[PDB]
Amino acid sequence: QVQSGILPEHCRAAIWIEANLKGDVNALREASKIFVDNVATFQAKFPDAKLGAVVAFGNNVWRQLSGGEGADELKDFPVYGKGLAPSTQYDLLIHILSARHEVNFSVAQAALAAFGDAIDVKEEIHGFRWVEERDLSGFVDGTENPAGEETRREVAVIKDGVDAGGSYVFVQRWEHNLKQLNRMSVPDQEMMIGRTKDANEEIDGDERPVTSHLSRVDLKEDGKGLKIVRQSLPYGTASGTHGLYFCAYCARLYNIEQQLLSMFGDTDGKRDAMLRFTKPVTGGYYFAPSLERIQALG
Amino acid sequence: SQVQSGILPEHCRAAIWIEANLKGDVNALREASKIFVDNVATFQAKFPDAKLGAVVAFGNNVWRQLSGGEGADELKDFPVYGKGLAPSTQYDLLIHILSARHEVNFSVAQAALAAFGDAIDVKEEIHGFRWVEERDLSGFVDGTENPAGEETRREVAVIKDGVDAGGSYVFVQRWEHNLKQLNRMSVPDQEMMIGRTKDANEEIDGDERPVTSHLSRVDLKEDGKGLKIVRQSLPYGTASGTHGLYFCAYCARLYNIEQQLLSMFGDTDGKRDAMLRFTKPVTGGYYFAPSLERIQALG
Ligand code: HEM
Ligand code: HEM
Ligand SMILES: [C-]#N
Ligand SMILES: [C-]#N
Ligand SMILES: [Mg+2]
Ligand SMILES: [Mg+2]
């Protein structure tokens, strides 16, 4: 019932396509059914890839496709920090992940053939897992990410009601300035993140700044963690733009939004220390329906 | 007398090509090149699993300066072919990194940029990937008649004696495929354009295919001796944006490459390559890849 791209772990490569609807919204119903069938065909042809994919929709388009039923938290991605986090809300998100970039490329081509000229592609990002599963900053990223199908489903997948099997998606492309990062001593970079760089040990919450990344995003509400399932990957060229393509799934949009309000100064007026070397340049929220919901579109 | 590690490896799934111009004094390339080939050895020791190789190669103007004009007799700036059908974008430096792991290539590319620093102006950076069934994005298999095995690849690509022993000439040319235009062609018309069958990859006989077919343009012989080259090309791009083939070839003589270009672009017999119907070259450059010892001896 869940779309195949939400739960797989340790993907080596991904493709994210963000697009606007040019045509009639009804064009998305047949295209989405064709695409999920193409995904099943590619999984049968390349079982070693561990391929998964997700089709997700922006607020305006999803309200039309669903007739206003469910997806109660869905809204256009707002700016956070009064503009520190910009907003680039589009209508459609396609997320393709697997162990093989070449298979993702064929799947991306099938997605574009299915949607055709009904969409205007705004962004296409090719993610790759880097050496030692580190972010391009040199810090390991995924250590506290929910692990195993059971916990990932608990965090990411809606349990009951009309949206059972669905998930909320957040995508945000960051552009790293590695020259500005390298000007920082390793201990200063470690206090900025909240984990040691080489050994990847958590720095105690009482011993690191409240602006450290972990202090901004490891949030609890009366001891219950506001967890999310991250599928982010590094991207870019060595000589041009590079950074992290942030991607997260959650059964509630609330958990993601509380982390953004914290990181961008809206909650307590303090900003994530990572803003010293990297910045977000896109931002969008989407609703990922269940596979049964996609089949019930036409 | 040792060949640079990136020329001969076969079947590497990923590559990075960086093309750049020199901003200041040519001297800056001397230490940077030594640092970079040392970084390559360090990365091979750290990621023995990667099967990493790399090449540093130089354009005519900068190689004449670094070599004092000795050797590399065929080197010259890449000219236009077909009076402009093949454009020319000759730069000063080419860095080619290939391995079984794109992530390792990325670290090596960053080390190359750290070594050369602000002495260079990067003009192009292309990330190549091997596609499904080793096919070009056009859907045709690549590589079938490419020299195979170290022995033949060395014979074709590596200079055997003299001051340039262990070196090679490099040609790079980025093509932009129009897959929509290709898909308007029937499969039999695409097969006559290439000179091989599409699904089974069987050669169409030379007397049964047009003289404009790709194989008829580039499978050239001089009294029965093939003008062979070692190709290291890979597909590149985005599905929604620009994509195609990043053509890359190594040869012990620049002559073999040039005869194929004169043929493909209409200079030899007035006929051009049928692939121009759906794809076009947008860059072009020739470089000289010295042997590892000649790079170590830069100073
Ligand atoms: C430049 C952008 C970012 C970088 C480089 C980055 C990097 C990291 C690193 C290195 C970790 C620690 C390793 C781990 O446990 O996964 C981490 C953890 C985390 N990040 Fe980020 N991050 C970024 C943006 C974001 C954003 C935008 C969010 C949420 C909206 C976020 C949410 C999280 C969460 C929830 C954790 C786990 C915290 C915990 O429970 O320990 N990150 N990030
Ligand atoms: C869009 C650009 C190109 C495409 C799609 C392309 C495609 C192909 C294909 C499908 C083959 C047949 C399989 C094989 O034997 O490898 C081939 C062969 C070959 N291509 Fe290309 N090619 C391109 C450009 C070039 C260029 C620029 C050159 C040389 C300057 C070249 C030289 C060769 C050679 C020597 C062969 C082997 C011919 C033989 O001996 O049978 N190609 N190419
Ligand atoms: C954080 N990723
Ligand atoms: C030709 N490759
Ligand atoms: Mg924690
Ligand atoms: Mg032949």
XYZ file of C-alpha atoms and ligand atoms in Angstrom:
689
model
C 0.000 0.000 0.000
C 2.827 2.546 0.735
C 4.573 3.972 -2.380
C 7.837 2.030 -2.856
C 10.268 4.987 -2.430
C 9.439 6.008 1.157
C 10.812 3.159 3.308
C 13.980 1.710 1.591
C 17.220 2.367 3.479
C 20.799 3.134 2.421
C 20.010 4.112 -1.221
C 23.215 4.875 -3.210
C 21.600 7.239 -5.700
C 18.409 9.236 -6.265
C 16.739 11.557 -8.740
C 14.307 14.261 -7.606
C 12.140 16.019 -10.192
C 10.052 19.049 -9.158
C 7.495 20.356 -11.662
C 4.443 22.584 -12.183
C 1.225 21.480 -13.835
C 0.814 23.322 -17.193
C -2.235 21.368 -18.322
C -5.492 20.124 -16.845
C -5.018 18.525 -13.384
C -6.903 15.451 -14.734
C -3.688 14.758 -16.898
C -1.950 13.811 -13.589
C -4.367 10.927 -12.853
C -3.518 8.708 -15.881
C 0.197 9.730 -15.788
C 0.545 8.765 -12.109
C -1.011 5.261 -12.738
C 1.308 4.740 -15.747
C 4.349 5.792 -13.710
C 3.676 3.490 -10.705
C 3.223 0.586 -13.205
C 6.602 1.551 -14.834
C 8.182 1.409 -11.320
C 6.894 -2.191 -10.838
C 8.267 -3.103 -14.315
C 11.701 -1.618 -13.465
C 11.761 -3.447 -10.063
C 11.044 -6.770 -11.849
C 13.796 -6.057 -14.462
C 16.416 -4.817 -11.875
C 15.688 -6.629 -8.576
C 19.321 -5.967 -7.436
C 18.714 -2.176 -7.602
C 16.242 -2.177 -4.623
C 14.436 0.550 -6.619
C 11.704 2.627 -5.109
C 9.884 5.748 -6.190
C 7.325 8.279 -4.988
C 4.876 10.605 -6.810
C 3.693 13.423 -4.494
C 1.494 16.469 -4.982
C 1.454 20.099 -3.913
C -1.445 21.589 -1.937
C -3.520 23.135 -4.770
C -3.244 20.090 -7.052
C -3.819 17.568 -4.217
C -6.937 19.451 -3.008
C -8.304 19.076 -6.593
C -7.330 15.387 -7.021
C -8.670 14.433 -3.548
C -11.829 16.607 -3.704
C -10.649 18.305 -0.473
C -10.830 15.032 1.543
C -7.941 14.235 3.934
C -4.356 15.592 3.857
C -5.526 18.038 6.582
C -2.043 19.426 7.370
C -1.104 20.001 3.669
C -0.407 23.605 2.741
C 1.923 25.549 0.452
C 5.458 25.598 1.887
C 5.699 28.998 3.658
C 8.928 30.974 4.089
C 10.569 30.357 7.502
C 12.673 32.874 9.425
C 10.762 35.618 7.492
C 12.708 34.584 4.306
C 15.918 32.860 5.588
C 14.316 29.640 4.246
C 12.897 30.609 0.797
C 9.777 28.985 -0.664
C 9.556 27.396 -4.163
C 6.304 25.418 -3.921
C 5.577 23.385 -7.086
C 2.735 21.001 -8.037
C 4.494 17.679 -8.481
C 7.446 15.887 -6.903
C 8.905 12.634 -8.316
C 11.511 10.953 -6.068
C 13.390 7.943 -7.508
C 15.925 6.049 -5.357
C 17.917 2.849 -5.775
C 21.425 1.342 -5.553
C 22.022 2.187 -9.261
C 22.052 5.695 -10.748
C 21.665 4.226 -14.328
C 18.397 2.517 -13.341
C 17.151 5.781 -11.731
C 17.922 7.562 -15.028
C 15.721 5.097 -17.040
C 12.933 5.499 -14.410
C 13.241 9.346 -14.615
C 12.844 9.101 -18.438
C 9.727 6.887 -17.952
C 8.274 9.473 -15.491
C 8.775 12.269 -18.058
C 7.237 10.095 -20.842
C 4.196 9.363 -18.610
C 3.499 13.006 -17.567
C 4.513 14.391 -21.003
C 3.845 18.052 -21.777
C 1.240 18.285 -18.924
C 4.218 19.333 -16.651
C 6.916 22.026 -16.633
C 10.067 20.608 -14.951
C 11.458 23.259 -12.544
C 14.254 21.250 -10.865
C 16.048 17.903 -11.544
C 18.685 16.879 -8.961
C 20.847 13.740 -9.063
C 21.765 12.653 -5.540
C 24.679 10.347 -4.725
C 25.789 8.758 -1.437
C 29.349 10.059 -0.805
C 32.406 8.287 0.762
C 31.670 6.776 4.267
C 28.024 7.964 3.898
C 29.192 11.502 4.816
C 27.592 14.787 3.897
C 29.966 16.901 1.640
C 30.765 18.890 4.856
C 32.599 15.661 5.999
C 30.076 14.752 8.759
C 28.381 11.331 8.714
C 24.598 11.896 7.949
C 21.839 9.284 8.928
C 23.008 8.101 12.380
C 19.737 9.021 14.199
C 17.524 8.446 11.160
C 14.756 5.846 11.966
C 16.119 2.340 11.176
C 14.318 -0.804 9.943
C 10.943 -1.064 8.188
C 8.923 -1.193 11.450
C 10.133 2.143 12.916
C 10.344 3.877 9.526
C 6.672 2.943 8.857
C 5.707 4.154 12.375
C 7.401 7.534 11.713
C 6.601 8.115 8.014
C 3.373 6.295 7.110
C -0.180 7.477 7.985
C -1.871 4.653 10.056
C -5.622 4.991 9.382
C -8.414 6.912 7.640
C -8.693 8.055 4.045
C -4.874 8.820 3.915
C -3.719 5.404 5.384
C -0.473 4.416 3.635
C 0.313 8.011 2.609
C 3.023 10.395 3.848
C 3.931 14.115 3.883
C 7.140 15.020 2.001
C 9.442 18.002 2.420
C 12.220 18.837 -0.095
C 14.810 21.635 0.249
C 18.035 22.016 -1.733
C 21.018 23.423 0.216
C 24.108 25.022 -1.364
C 27.280 24.414 0.669
C 30.156 26.909 0.753
C 32.982 24.442 1.568
C 35.569 27.299 1.500
C 33.666 28.974 4.420
C 33.384 25.608 6.202
C 37.132 24.870 5.832
C 37.964 28.288 7.448
C 36.393 26.812 10.660
C 38.551 24.677 12.987
C 37.329 21.028 13.342
C 36.208 21.674 17.001
C 34.133 24.725 15.818
C 32.543 22.622 13.024
C 31.762 19.937 15.656
C 30.026 22.480 17.940
C 28.105 23.760 14.852
C 26.792 20.232 14.089
C 26.609 18.770 17.613
C 28.514 15.542 16.704
C 32.287 14.843 16.459
C 33.513 14.892 12.850
C 35.782 11.809 12.421
C 34.285 9.442 15.069
C 30.672 10.731 14.679
C 29.936 10.721 18.478
C 27.100 12.873 19.803
C 28.337 15.895 21.830
C 26.213 15.993 25.009
C 23.192 18.370 24.722
C 24.292 20.261 27.875
C 27.910 20.747 26.387
C 27.053 22.077 22.888
C 25.502 25.410 21.824
C 21.688 25.660 21.574
C 22.334 26.844 17.919
C 24.060 23.464 17.103
C 22.215 21.543 14.413
C 21.279 18.634 16.774
C 20.008 21.132 19.402
C 17.833 22.758 16.691
C 16.304 19.521 15.254
C 16.399 16.802 17.981
C 13.090 18.049 19.455
C 10.875 16.343 22.035
C 7.360 17.129 23.281
C 7.152 15.863 26.852
C 9.865 13.274 26.042
C 8.364 12.064 22.693
C 10.771 12.741 19.800
C 9.395 14.585 16.742
C 10.924 12.016 14.362
C 11.148 12.147 10.537
C 12.488 9.681 7.893
C 15.265 11.468 5.952
C 16.198 10.393 2.377
C 18.663 13.287 1.677
C 21.748 12.917 -0.487
C 24.710 15.030 -1.553
C 24.585 16.488 -5.126
C 26.470 18.748 -7.511
C 29.790 19.289 -9.247
C 33.158 19.778 -7.505
C 33.788 23.078 -9.410
C 30.185 24.399 -9.375
C 27.182 24.278 -7.061
C 27.092 21.398 -4.551
C 25.505 20.619 -1.219
C 22.715 18.500 0.271
C 19.371 17.815 -1.355
C 17.339 17.572 1.848
C 14.335 15.210 1.634
C 12.146 13.985 4.513
C 8.966 11.909 4.966
C 6.661 12.034 8.007
C 3.140 10.779 8.885
C 2.615 14.327 10.202
C 3.769 17.524 8.534
C 3.925 18.982 12.126
C 7.251 17.233 13.017
C 8.992 18.676 9.956
C 7.534 22.179 10.524
C 8.622 22.287 14.209
C 12.223 21.504 13.098
C 12.105 24.300 10.457
C 10.635 26.855 12.904
C 13.511 25.927 15.268
C 16.311 25.997 12.637
C 15.239 29.319 11.072
C 14.728 31.435 14.247
C 10.915 31.433 14.467
C 10.603 29.461 17.711
C 13.201 31.038 20.032
C 14.937 33.645 17.862
C 18.092 31.448 17.544
C 19.231 30.099 14.125
C 20.927 26.885 13.068
C 24.760 27.330 13.244
C 25.035 25.544 9.807
C 23.835 28.803 8.211
C 27.512 29.962 8.678
C 28.530 27.752 5.657
C 25.384 26.476 3.813
C 22.003 27.899 2.750
C 18.623 26.605 1.522
C 17.621 27.825 -1.969
C 14.350 25.838 -2.642
C 11.504 24.615 -0.416
C 8.279 22.660 -0.939
C 5.744 20.430 0.879
C 3.973 17.561 -0.895
C 1.514 14.775 -0.080
C 2.475 11.237 -1.126
C -0.655 9.142 -1.467
C -0.791 5.395 -0.950
C -0.625 3.140 -4.018
C -4.338 2.220 -3.583
C -5.227 5.969 -3.580
C -3.225 6.472 -6.813
C -5.109 3.568 -8.480
C -8.441 5.125 -7.319
C -7.690 8.432 -9.172
C -9.383 7.507 -12.541
C 58.054 5.140 -18.687
C 54.813 4.569 -16.723
C 51.417 5.344 -18.247
C 49.012 7.613 -16.292
C 46.510 5.352 -14.451
C 43.320 6.604 -16.226
C 44.139 5.677 -19.871
C 43.911 1.875 -19.983
C 41.210 0.718 -17.470
C 38.162 -0.911 -19.094
C 34.500 -1.122 -17.930
C 34.721 1.749 -15.348
C 31.105 2.705 -14.579
C 31.716 6.393 -13.688
C 33.936 9.297 -14.695
C 34.482 12.996 -14.147
C 36.016 15.230 -16.843
C 37.167 18.749 -15.942
C 38.259 21.160 -18.700
C 39.925 24.433 -17.654
C 41.987 27.431 -18.797
C 45.177 28.695 -17.133
C 44.646 32.162 -15.474
C 48.213 33.134 -14.623
C 51.757 31.918 -14.933
C 52.137 28.393 -16.481
C 54.553 27.575 -13.628
C 51.576 27.055 -11.310
C 50.699 23.835 -13.274
C 54.065 22.224 -12.317
C 53.580 21.759 -8.545
C 49.774 21.317 -8.942
C 50.193 18.396 -11.378
C 52.687 16.638 -9.033
C 50.345 17.154 -6.067
C 47.400 15.767 -8.062
C 49.096 12.554 -9.291
C 50.253 11.975 -5.640
C 46.595 12.482 -4.517
C 45.572 9.805 -7.103
C 48.028 7.303 -5.508
C 46.661 8.232 -2.026
C 43.057 7.667 -3.195
C 43.998 4.295 -4.821
C 45.589 3.182 -1.493
C 42.486 4.336 0.505
C 39.909 2.836 -1.983
C 41.587 -0.211 -3.512
C 37.942 -1.394 -4.233
C 37.314 1.667 -6.528
C 39.742 0.584 -9.310
C 40.526 4.301 -9.646
C 42.519 5.855 -12.473
C 43.088 9.441 -13.587
C 44.774 11.501 -16.286
C 46.135 15.045 -16.341
C 46.588 16.338 -19.926
C 47.612 19.650 -21.446
C 46.601 21.825 -24.377
C 49.058 22.816 -27.105
C 50.048 26.250 -25.797
C 50.725 25.185 -22.187
C 52.386 21.827 -23.159
C 54.768 23.621 -25.546
C 55.768 25.837 -22.552
C 56.063 23.012 -19.990
C 57.993 20.742 -22.436
C 60.209 23.511 -23.890
C 58.862 22.479 -27.336
C 60.380 18.972 -27.196
C 58.176 16.035 -28.390
C 54.386 15.961 -28.748
C 55.017 16.694 -32.460
C 51.387 16.175 -33.577
C 49.896 18.365 -30.777
C 47.982 21.435 -31.968
C 44.893 23.392 -30.944
C 41.705 21.488 -31.863
C 40.645 23.013 -35.224
C 37.023 23.276 -36.377
C 36.038 20.392 -38.681
C 33.460 20.587 -41.460
C 34.120 24.383 -41.568
C 32.304 24.696 -38.166
C 29.995 21.613 -37.960
C 32.386 20.417 -35.219
C 33.032 23.538 -33.076
C 36.329 24.086 -31.276
C 36.638 24.898 -27.551
C 40.355 24.299 -26.931
C 41.303 24.750 -23.271
C 44.627 24.423 -21.409
C 43.997 21.584 -19.003
C 42.000 18.347 -19.004
C 41.516 16.191 -15.876
C 39.879 12.772 -16.507
C 38.986 10.635 -13.435
C 37.411 7.135 -13.800
C 36.571 4.331 -11.339
C 33.893 1.883 -10.188
C 32.647 4.524 -7.668
C 31.260 7.966 -8.581
C 31.670 9.108 -4.885
C 35.427 8.379 -5.003
C 35.681 10.263 -8.346
C 33.977 13.236 -6.641
C 36.619 13.317 -3.816
C 39.404 13.028 -6.461
C 37.810 15.908 -8.476
C 37.795 18.058 -5.271
C 41.503 17.180 -4.692
C 42.308 18.196 -8.316
C 40.602 21.585 -7.768
C 42.406 22.063 -4.407
C 45.771 21.272 -6.085
C 45.359 23.650 -9.081
C 43.539 26.297 -6.981
C 42.901 29.717 -8.485
C 45.585 29.153 -11.213
C 42.718 27.638 -13.352
C 39.300 28.727 -14.611
C 37.037 25.635 -14.877
C 35.144 25.772 -18.209
C 33.441 22.345 -18.049
C 32.735 19.630 -15.493
C 30.897 16.515 -16.764
C 29.887 13.458 -14.708
C 29.753 10.382 -16.925
C 27.833 7.210 -16.061
C 27.620 3.808 -17.788
C 23.941 3.294 -18.742
C 21.892 0.016 -18.809
C 23.388 -2.788 -20.999
C 26.389 -0.485 -21.772
C 24.169 1.396 -24.246
C 24.543 4.946 -25.403
C 21.410 7.055 -24.474
C 20.355 6.567 -28.174
C 19.758 2.868 -27.181
C 22.709 1.461 -29.217
C 25.371 -0.664 -27.464
C 28.697 1.114 -27.027
C 32.143 -0.339 -27.056
C 31.862 -3.441 -29.229
C 34.865 -2.641 -31.521
C 36.798 -0.673 -28.883
C 40.322 -2.186 -28.313
C 40.007 -4.849 -25.573
C 42.490 -5.969 -22.940
C 45.544 -4.127 -21.643
C 47.875 -5.416 -24.376
C 45.929 -4.071 -27.394
C 44.804 -0.921 -25.557
C 48.489 -0.095 -24.792
C 49.430 -0.822 -28.451
C 46.708 1.605 -29.660
C 46.874 4.365 -27.004
C 50.394 4.502 -25.535
C 53.473 6.064 -27.249
C 56.165 3.268 -27.340
C 59.528 5.148 -27.464
C 61.320 8.502 -27.526
C 60.796 11.446 -25.127
C 56.970 10.886 -25.123
C 57.181 7.074 -24.292
C 54.240 6.233 -21.983
C 52.253 9.315 -23.073
C 49.085 9.571 -25.167
C 47.050 12.109 -27.198
C 43.545 12.796 -25.866
C 40.479 14.094 -27.677
C 37.318 15.228 -25.800
C 34.028 16.334 -27.398
C 30.666 16.692 -25.654
C 27.613 15.732 -27.755
C 24.033 16.846 -27.036
C 21.466 14.232 -28.080
C 17.972 15.201 -29.250
C 16.163 11.946 -28.287
C 12.817 13.337 -29.522
C 14.349 13.696 -33.037
C 15.910 10.199 -32.753
C 12.570 8.627 -31.709
C 10.893 10.141 -34.874
C 13.187 7.763 -36.861
C 12.057 4.154 -37.439
C 14.385 1.508 -35.853
C 15.621 0.369 -39.350
C 16.510 4.044 -40.213
C 18.375 4.423 -36.878
C 20.221 1.154 -37.659
C 21.302 2.425 -41.108
C 22.399 5.707 -39.408
C 24.663 3.795 -36.961
C 25.656 0.796 -39.096
C 24.765 -1.813 -36.398
C 21.394 -3.406 -35.461
C 19.845 -1.774 -32.386
C 18.603 -4.636 -30.152
C 21.049 -7.464 -31.126
C 24.024 -5.110 -31.874
C 25.098 -7.020 -35.077
C 27.255 -5.127 -37.632
C 25.358 -4.292 -40.865
C 27.691 -5.239 -43.802
C 29.730 -2.298 -45.148
C 28.280 -2.767 -48.705
C 24.668 -2.910 -47.327
C 24.728 0.321 -45.248
C 25.036 3.972 -46.361
C 28.530 5.506 -46.628
C 27.170 8.218 -44.185
C 26.538 5.512 -41.488
C 28.608 6.084 -38.361
C 30.648 2.839 -38.808
C 31.334 3.729 -42.492
C 32.599 7.163 -41.333
C 34.903 5.949 -38.487
C 35.953 2.319 -39.236
C 38.843 3.531 -41.431
C 41.747 1.475 -42.789
C 44.966 2.483 -44.570
C 45.933 -0.428 -46.799
C 44.075 -2.810 -44.440
C 45.501 -1.392 -41.146
C 42.704 -0.005 -38.937
C 43.124 3.551 -37.581
C 42.271 2.429 -34.043
C 41.602 4.585 -30.951
C 40.807 3.722 -27.282
C 37.417 5.257 -26.418
C 36.521 6.117 -22.767
C 33.218 7.913 -23.556
C 30.201 7.821 -21.267
C 26.629 9.060 -21.273
C 25.905 12.182 -19.135
C 23.147 14.621 -18.248
C 19.656 14.922 -16.795
C 16.515 13.237 -18.149
C 14.660 16.614 -18.383
C 17.626 18.776 -19.504
C 20.760 18.396 -21.611
C 22.037 14.838 -22.105
C 24.134 12.921 -24.582
C 27.586 11.363 -24.898
C 30.784 12.822 -23.491
C 33.114 11.524 -26.201
C 36.668 10.815 -24.996
C 39.421 8.986 -26.902
C 43.126 8.196 -26.394
C 45.590 7.349 -29.198
C 49.401 7.038 -29.531
C 48.987 9.191 -32.683
C 46.649 12.184 -32.969
C 46.434 11.250 -36.741
C 43.937 8.340 -36.195
C 41.505 10.583 -34.322
C 41.836 13.413 -36.880
C 41.177 11.104 -39.879
C 37.904 9.969 -38.189
C 36.849 13.611 -37.580
C 37.688 14.690 -41.170
C 35.519 11.752 -42.330
C 32.585 12.365 -39.917
C 32.375 16.112 -40.582
C 32.532 16.169 -44.428
C 36.149 17.249 -44.980
C 37.383 14.026 -46.601
C 34.672 13.134 -49.145
C 31.947 15.782 -48.760
C 29.620 13.327 -46.878
C 28.927 13.680 -43.131
C 27.993 11.348 -40.313
C 24.264 10.392 -40.338
C 24.214 10.801 -36.471
C 24.175 14.582 -37.069
C 20.415 14.005 -37.746
C 19.774 13.682 -33.977
C 22.927 14.700 -32.005
C 25.535 17.460 -32.242
C 29.003 18.216 -30.840
C 29.174 21.415 -28.743
C 32.821 21.307 -27.432
C 36.123 20.051 -28.854
C 39.720 19.892 -27.634
C 43.015 18.007 -28.108
C 45.394 17.388 -25.196
C 48.684 15.602 -24.528
C 48.778 13.203 -21.538
C 52.456 12.811 -20.481
C 53.770 9.640 -18.824
C 53.716 9.614 -14.960
C 57.537 10.152 -14.791
C 57.253 13.265 -17.016
C 54.604 14.646 -14.579
C 56.891 13.789 -11.574
C 59.755 15.523 -13.368
C 57.712 18.817 -13.721
C 59.752 21.378 -11.897
C 22.698 21.674 5.121
C 21.682 21.027 5.579
C 21.854 19.944 6.517
C 22.982 19.269 6.906
C 24.384 19.310 6.372
C 22.545 18.358 7.931
C 23.421 17.487 8.534
C 23.081 16.650 9.557
C 23.989 15.801 10.259
C 25.460 15.691 9.985
C 23.278 15.131 11.178
C 23.794 14.129 12.180
C 23.769 12.716 11.623
C 22.400 12.074 11.710
O 21.961 11.709 12.812
O 21.762 11.915 10.682
C 21.924 15.600 11.048
C 20.891 15.157 11.796
C 19.587 15.569 11.653
N 19.098 16.488 10.825
Fe 20.165 17.485 9.578
N 21.262 18.547 8.154
C 20.753 19.458 7.390
C 19.481 19.946 7.292
C 18.406 19.492 8.001
C 17.074 19.969 7.898
C 16.600 21.057 6.973
C 16.327 19.207 8.798
C 14.884 19.222 9.149
C 14.018 20.045 8.634
C 17.257 18.296 9.423
C 16.903 17.368 10.371
C 17.801 16.532 10.997
C 17.386 15.579 12.058
C 16.019 15.328 12.571
C 18.509 14.964 12.461
C 18.619 13.921 13.528
C 18.773 14.622 14.893
C 18.799 13.619 16.034
O 17.756 13.144 16.446
O 19.871 13.314 16.517
N 18.462 18.533 8.916
N 21.863 16.501 10.061
C 27.117 11.126 -30.461
C 28.299 10.672 -30.686
C 28.595 9.271 -30.914
C 27.789 8.170 -30.764
C 26.376 8.075 -30.237
C 28.596 7.067 -31.191
C 28.111 5.764 -31.167
C 28.802 4.683 -31.582
C 28.278 3.366 -31.603
C 26.895 2.973 -31.175
C 29.255 2.552 -32.053
C 29.153 1.058 -32.291
C 29.629 0.206 -31.133
C 31.119 0.187 -30.960
O 31.792 -0.489 -31.704
O 31.634 0.806 -30.025
C 30.380 3.404 -32.333
C 31.571 2.952 -32.797
C 32.645 3.769 -32.999
N 32.720 5.099 -32.866
Fe 31.312 6.242 -32.270
N 29.776 7.497 -31.588
C 29.893 8.773 -31.473
C 30.952 9.608 -31.767
C 32.182 9.204 -32.201
C 33.296 10.041 -32.511
C 33.326 11.553 -32.382
C 34.302 9.199 -32.914
C 35.678 9.502 -33.344
C 36.149 10.703 -33.490
C 33.777 7.866 -32.860
C 34.477 6.745 -33.156
C 33.953 5.459 -33.149
C 34.763 4.265 -33.539
C 36.203 4.173 -33.949
C 33.942 3.213 -33.435
C 34.310 1.790 -33.727
C 34.043 1.533 -35.216
C 34.378 0.121 -35.635
O 35.558 -0.139 -35.783
O 33.488 -0.709 -35.801
N 32.506 7.949 -32.452
N 30.059 4.664 -32.036
C 19.924 16.074 8.003
N 19.947 15.491 7.078
C 31.821 6.141 -30.206
N 31.769 6.012 -29.110
Mg 18.779 12.247 20.111
Mg 35.432 -3.162 -38.367
